[PDB]
Structure 1
């Protein structure tokens, strides 16, 4: 699924991401935008044996198990394929876990690079949250 920004925003909001650990919803939507282009199926197969999965491009080294990534910690305790669901819950839950595991949203390089410092509320602006 490729979300629209507002739809994603609403979904993320339903999942409690707005202001999760102080990150407003737009941050999360922005992260998704730049991580995956809102594409729940996004994968980025890295050369480092990990892959980034899903709308938030959560990486398989620490966060989810894809069974092929060295150093797997599977801290989200999920198969990475769960992060490729059309529903975002697993990604959200894992995203929450990423932050709960002492990361900020700097855990997401696209957030850091493309959302950080920006009008992330643009990503929820004009939406029905």
Structure 2
């Protein structure tokens, strides 16, 4: 599923993402936008280390979800990577919360540093009623 901007904003708020570990909803929106374009079935294979990023938040198979084909992988979140390609984002959200429970926080995603960090991100949630 490809979420419409505000539709996603409201859904993330309802799921308790606003201010989770100090991360504003605007920031979670900026991350989803650059990671997958708000697309739940987005997948990206990293030929360099043989891992794959899954879902709306592009969660990595080496540490957060299990896909069986990733060399020396762990399952911090403890989910099947399959769960992160569903239209319902409850599991993707729980996985994203687990990632930021590590000291790096939102910085775990390279894309966030490049396109969100130290920027005016209000535009991602403006007019959505959140």
Q: TM-score, normalised by structure 2?
A: 0.95
Q: 1: CA distance between counterparts of 2:127 and 2:5?
A: 10
CA RMSD of aligned residues (A): 1.0
Alignment of 1:41 with 2:41, yes or no, is: yes
Summarize the alignment of residues 79-98 of structure 1 with structure 2, pairs less than 5 Å apart: 79-98=80-99
Q: Which runs of 5+ in 2 are unaligned?
A: none
Shift of 1:40: 0.5
Does the 8 Å contact 1:56/1:91 carry over to 2? yes
| Correspondences of 1:19-34 after superposition (within 5 Å) | 19-34=19-34
Aligned to 2:119: 118
Q: How many residues align?
A: 129
- SS of the aligned residue for 1:51 comes to strand
Measure, in 2, the Cα distance between the counterparts of 1:97 and 1:6: 24
Residues 96-117 of structure 1, C-alpha deviations (whole Å, 9 max, x = no match): 0001133311111211211112
Stretch moving more, 114-123 or 50-59: 114-123
Structure 1 match to 2:17: 17
Structure 2: distance between partners of 1:6 and 1:55: 15
Q: TM-score, normalised by structure 1?
A: 0.95
- Name the structure with the higher strand share: 2
My pick for the range that moved more, 81-90 or 23-32, is 81-90
Match of 2:57 in 1: 56
Secondary structure of 1:12's partner?
helix
Q: Distance in 2 between matches of 1:17 and 1:122?
A: 17
Question: Secondary structure of 2:7's match?
Answer: helix
Deviations 1:83-108 (A, max 9, x none): 11111111110110001133311111
1:122 Cα deviation from its structure 2 partner: 1.1
Question: Could you tell me whether the CA contact under 8 Å between 1:42 and 1:53 is conserved in 2?
Answer: yes
